[PDB]
Design goal:
The structure is cut from a larger assembly and holds 6 copies of chain A.
Chain A (H helix, E strand, L loop, with lengths): L19 E10 L4 E10 L7 E11 L4 E5 L4 E15 L7 E6 L6 E19 L5 E19 L1 E6 L5 E8 L2 E3 L2 E4 L35 H4 L6 E7 L7 E19 L4 E21 L4 E3 L1
């Protein structure tokens, strides 16, 4: 930070003694079930070499964890969200540039532990027949331990350019009734993929053998709420002071099937079966400091 | 945050140099046992493109954990709250939109640990008859550990649109006298569901074999206090400056029955047996900046 | 800090009552996949003996983890980023000097634990034939444990001079499907290097046996975002008030090959096979307090 | 602190309503590889009985971990930094005094744990031939555990006077590929000192059997950045208002040799074989409030 | 605090809207190796019933851990600091009083853990001769664990009066090459006191068998830096406005001797062998608000 | 707090825009060894319905842990402080009331852990004579663990009235050379109470067999420093504006006796053998906002 290089806190930051023009644009895509919200802030700092627009993409993409198919009592299918995506894109003819973004990719850590034990033991054995025994023993043991945190979903900043930025929140793995964790590639020769299997050999219909959504991650059913920030820069003496920007919300859905194998349930996951894409074009007026649909 | 993109803290926030009009509306629903409180804040920031109304739903929904049925000394029933709900809804013809909400759904994590141990041991055994024996052995062990936090109740933001938003606090699982945890689907072939049974084979009346409310979650008897925030946006030059909004409080009650099976007690839980719903219509005057019932 | 030597906080910091001139310069190198961003701040504090320019190098270097070669079904190659580098360099004829930098190299710690246990046991055994036996035993064990944190990538400040400063983020080690950790030098006589092996003996094409990028560090595929800071000083009454500075972004790529050995897969890693360099020259005008390409 | 003795926070600190004169002096010693930086602050507080100069010594001393000798394929030598030192000295005829310094020596702690466990066991055994046997046993065990943190390098304030102050950062111990930790005095009859030994019996050139610098502490190769502070006091009505001060940076280098003993590698460390010393004299003008070389 | 009794924080503190007169007095005792520093603050708050002088004693008492005696290859002695002391004393004829001091004695805590385990086991054994045997067993175990922190040195406020106050930092115990901890009274029949024994039976000179000072607490060799605060009160309308105060720094040195017992080394510690006292008299002028030697 | 009920922080606190009159009264009782200090604050807030006096009792009560009796070499006695007390009392005819106090009694917690493990093992044993044996075993284990913190001394607020308030700091239990903890009621048939015995069977004088005060809690020898706050209210329009208050400091001392039982040492503790009590009457003038002896 600034204090690490002997500089007062906030000295190098943008936006002091500036009037900031903020706004909210709200859309609801009913077919895709996406509540999209753009919170924008225009910052024209006289001491900064460019004009800034901060765009925060928020809202909620519904998970839509849903049993969608019932082929009798022995086969069923469940659609579930394996990824949520948010993308911002400027057309290539624009002179505005994507300057900053948040959050970014972090370096993950793990804790390592090493152990070395050694010991000696000895005993003497008695008896009422006068038999006397003895024993002397020694042992050594070496151990290694690895500890780390696994989230249910991972937030990843995809490789940005000066015209395009994006984030994806992807399914990592989940605990199923204290078992697991299972992921999209877990395989068992007997039961297949047990991601959303409720019982291994229950006698109910297949449509009733899926994990209850309250027992899974809330992102699967209620959905994910993005909170992403992009900073777009514009030259002050540019000829054209109007920009277009596209914002895309996305949901990728996998297909998890349960079928009865005459002795137990077997699960099978198919990746990226469906994609729901909701796009919206916005107009930025830099001189008026406003954003519209 | 702002400091992550080289921007002064609070630069992009709403409500600087603004007069905020606050208010409280309090109702008590005696039949449903709900103390409903609405704390509203009108923010008309000149630098923001819309008028904001922040509505905080608060109060308390009583748990109403109570023994409701006694069919002799051998069977009894207990009504208990498995869910609390808060919903806000705007009518279809309104111009105002639901812009923001809090809290949202967060990604939950788990801690994973793996262990690998290997060791060698050796011993020599003597005897008084000159018998000498030896032993050399080796061993290897692999372990996996999973750790995570389990709350008694989960707070879930249900999928919002621009016209309605909702939260639900649902029962997750509970510890019964250091045993468990048990949930609404726990089943034992001998005892059934042991969520609220006090003794496994006590010889008292069934109505006296339910877990004491002081030994359970305080949400079950004393109740739950919502603290939820919604932000509603309105255009400044809209023709009509009056909005209607519905606020609904809900309590879903399960039915837990104990009966004597001639050897021990057996428990059975029935889900969503009752629903208490208390609705209230409010009028928002944007020009006067007030809310009324 | 200042309070440790009885001095008010921030008393000795630079930049009070100063007008700071900030700016952003954004480039996108399409061939190298590098989004380069320079955030500069000119600080001319009258109470400081020199003019300061703080340069923050930011942006994102894409990882570009990708399968690049398929020699049939039994051989494949994967290019992956083992290092990301950022360098700033002043020409030797300049009079401006590199004054400060951040982050720097930290001293790492480990936690040590010692254990000493001793115990005694005894038992008596008796059969129905009047056989009575005894046993008395003692044991002692000594243990040592070492615990420390291992990041996936390490950030290192390379030894700076007054003309050039640099950072490198280098691959340390990675967990592969709860196994490992593996690094660039892990070797197994049977399987070779298992850094990005998906299955040990799976029967599939070699190009399909590499670890999924979602299951690895996000730095490998999506890439790394630099956050480095340099402080450059300049004399106030210097004759020439123009400086040149070179900023270089680098990506070093290793080559991980999988091949079928008729029984199982074997992986070999080749270090520093490719290097992608993206250099950019900037002009610093100290009088105008501006920075240009 | 002040609040512990009922005094407003910061009441007794120096530097309120004072103009502070700061400056930077940067030197690069190419022969010794030392980037030396002095950040000075002159504080003349009217309410303080003396003039203060705060000198912060910063910069970076390069580690210079490097293979320096190759006597064929069976012998090699590595020079590595075992200590970094920073010293400030005033000539004995000066009237200025060293008043304060930071950091200082802190008291280290350890965590102690005692355990006492006892138990009883019993079993009954029975064969198909009517043989019945019993066993009753008891045991007791006592354990002691000690836990503490061990940094790779220790920073120590050497005993100051009113004319000279100094710090040294010295090598403590290091983990070598999850083994150890090893220090400068570790000895093993078979392998000698295994501080920087890569393989115990690998068949390669001796120069290629040293631990890779990326797998060691970053201080060994990239180097150490001092962050030390000294406070010098001077009387206001002294006749001579000019002071001289010497600042010295030092690097002590050990010599680690690997040689082949026809069966395995053996390592030997020689302490304090080389010393690189970089000295610089500065002139302090108290009335002009400036510092020069 | 104030907020606990419904009072604004800082309301009851001293020193608001007050001019504070601060000063530094620095001495170096070369014979005793003590850098003594007094930082004083005069606070004359009009709303307080007395004049306050805050005296902070700082500086550094050198440890002076050194081998002082060699009586051949078989006997040696080492002087080491077992205590550092700081005392302030007012003459009994003074009317100023010691009113406050910091730090004070804290209440130390320990963590207690109780464990109770019980279990059952069973097994069946069968060989090729038809011999079938069984075993059923049960066990119970009770454990207690105690955990607390042990600093190397303890800081103790000695019982103050209104005329004298004092602190002592005393040696508590130390880890010797991962063994111990050892204290001044540790005794082993074979080796005596092993506080600073390097090797138990090494064949070297006795003077070379003492623990290296870099492997011990830095307080032992480099020394201890006091940071103690005293508050003196004076009546405003007192006839004489001049006070005398004595400040004493002290170092107590123990004598640790190593001698060869023809089989191994034996250590012996003698307590409080030497004491070094450095006393200084200061004059306090309450009218001029200054302190002098 | 205030923010929990939608109220600005500090809105409801006392003492804004108020002139506070503070003072210190210092006494030293030499016979009882008590340094008593009263720090008072008069607060007359116009918006508060009463005048407030905040009295902070501070200082130090010396522990006075000391050997007081020696009856030959086989019997000795030690006086040690088992309780420190501070009491404030208003006469019953006063109009002023005790309104608030700090600290108060807090609810203590414990951590509970339950464990259930079960396992299976198998065994196949061979021989050179062709004898083959097998074994199949199963086991189950249940465990409970309780963890909580135990301080050496407990601070307790005794039941206050409107005229009387008090605190006591009482001895809880102590660790004796890593054994224990022991308390005033610990009893062993062989050794009695081992609270302060240094050796169980050492052959020395009884007066030399007591634990070293440096190895015990510092409260036992150096003593306890109270920090207690009382708030006294008074009506503004009252006839008499002078109050009296008594402040009492107390130390209760137990008597720990060691005697030789011809085989080992035996300790006995006698509770509340001595009580040292020092009282002081203070006059409060509410009009002058002054407190005197």
């Amino acid at each position: 930070a600034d204090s690490d290089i002997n500089i007062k806190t906030g000295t190098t930051d943008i936006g002091s003694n500036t009037t900031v023009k903020t706004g909210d644009l709200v859309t609801y895509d009913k077919e895709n079930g996406m509540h999209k919200k753009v919170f924008y802030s225009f910052i024209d700092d006289k001491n900064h070499n460019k004009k800034l627009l901060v765009i925060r993409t928020k809202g909620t993409i519904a998970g839509q964890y849903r049993v969608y198919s019932e082929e009798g009592a022995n086969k069923s299918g469940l659609a579930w969200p394996s990824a949520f995506k948010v993308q911002l894109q400027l057309p290539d003819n624009e002179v505005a540039q994507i300057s900053d973004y948040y959050p970014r990719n972090s370096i993950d850590t793990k804790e390592y532990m090493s152990t070395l034990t050694y010991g000696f033991n000895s005993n003497v054995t008695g008896d009422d027949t006068g038999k006397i025994g003895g024993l002397i023993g020694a042992n050594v043991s070496i151990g290694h331990t690895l500890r780390y945190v696994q989230p249910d979903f991972k937030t990843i900043l995809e490789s940005p350019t000066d015209k395009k930025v994006g984030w994806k929140v992807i399914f990592n793995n989940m605990v199923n009734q204290n078992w697991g964790p299972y992921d999209r590639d877990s395989w068992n020769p007997v039961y297949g993929n047990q991601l959303f299997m409720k019982t291994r050999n229950g006698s109910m219909k297949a449509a009733d053998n899926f994990l209850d959504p309250n027992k899974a991650s809330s992102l699967l059913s209620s959905g994910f709420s993005p909170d992403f920030a992009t900073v777009i820069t514009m030259d002050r003496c540019a000829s054209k002071q109007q920009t277009n920007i596209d914002v895309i919300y996305e949901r990728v859905r996998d297909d998890y099937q349960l079928h009865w194998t005459s002795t137990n349930w077997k699960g099978t996951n198919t990746k990226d079966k469906w994609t729901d894409r909701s796009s919206e074009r916005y107009k930025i007026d830099w001189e008026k400091e406003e954003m519209t649909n």
